[PDB]
Each structure stands twice: as structure tokens, then as C-alpha cells.
Amino acid sequence: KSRQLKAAYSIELAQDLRAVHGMDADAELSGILATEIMLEINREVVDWINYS
């Protein structure tokens, strides 16, 4: 069984974010998504253990 998420950020936002804080608005988002996925996996594992 699978899982997956999207961010699909706009261009203008990223351009401006970089101008304001030096942030990419890509790498950060990418991180958030990947992290959210791993957070769920971690939680899934623990919950299955507690379930079972």
C-alpha cells in the first residue's frame, strides 16, 4: 500500500519569498511534504503496535 502528497508552488511566490527571507519555497516545501509522510509512517507503525 502507497501514499503521496503534492505542494505545486507558484513561481511568483517563490521569487518573492527568496527576496524577503532568502528562502527557496521549494526545498522547504519539499522538506515539509517528505517529513509529513515520514511522520505518518512513524505514527502508523506505533499505532499498529499499540493496536495489535
Binding site: 503534492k6 507558484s10 513561481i11 515520514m38 507503525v45 495489535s52
Partner: protein
């Protein structure tokens, strides 16, 4: 007794349980209680708090609904764990744009 493979070697528990573990002695003594130092109780730094008596891996379930612990066994094998994660695909990026307007 029930698995025939080995004795529990880890435990995941609520913050309150670990706070108790870290504030008491665990070795054989007359009595023992004080400021918590034995295990890390700060999930900020790590889920893994430490090893109980040098015998069990202590972790914190930061999302316990109220207050409990679960103890279990994991062996040198992978099947001998009870539970297993068997990835075929993982953390594979997806990349493109919408051609109509080129937004990413």
C-alpha cells in the same frame, strides 16, 4: 514466554512514565527518588530517552491519548519483530508543471 525468541528489549511509553523512570533508581536499592536525570524526558532532542538498566530501549510516545506503555521484543532478524515495513518505493520526488501556465 509466548514468542519463544527473546525477552522484551524495548518500551515506548507516555511522558509521565518516563518522567518516573528518570527520577527513580532502577538498580537494586533501598528506595530512590529525586530530580529526573536517568533518561531524557525531552522529546525535543529525542524520542529515545535511554536504556533501562542497560536492558530495555526506552522511548516516548508523544501522542499517548492519556497514559500507558507498551513493552515488546525485537530480535536480530527482521521477521522476529512481529511487525515489519517492507518498502518497494520510498520518498520518491514528483516533479513537473502545469503546461497551461507553467506553475510548478
Amino acid at each position: 514466554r509466548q514468542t519463544g525468541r527473546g525477552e522484551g528489549n524495548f518500551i515506548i511509553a507516555s511522558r509521565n512514565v518516563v518522567n518516573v523512570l528518570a527520577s527513580v533508581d532502577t538498580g537494586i536499592s533501598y528506595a530512590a527518588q529525586g530530580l529526573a536525570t536517568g533518561f531524557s524526558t525531552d522529546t525535543t532532542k529525542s524520542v529515545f530517552a535511554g536504556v533501562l538498566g542497560g536492558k530495555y530501549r526506552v522511548y516516548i510516545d508523544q501522542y499517548a491519548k492519556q497514559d500507558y506503555f507498551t513493552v515488546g521484543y525485537k530480535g536480530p532478524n527482521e521477521m522476529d519483530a512481529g511487525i515489519y515495513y517492507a518498502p518497494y518505493v520510498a520518498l520518491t520526488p514528483l516533479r513537473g508543471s502545469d503546461p497551461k501556465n507553467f506553475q510548478p
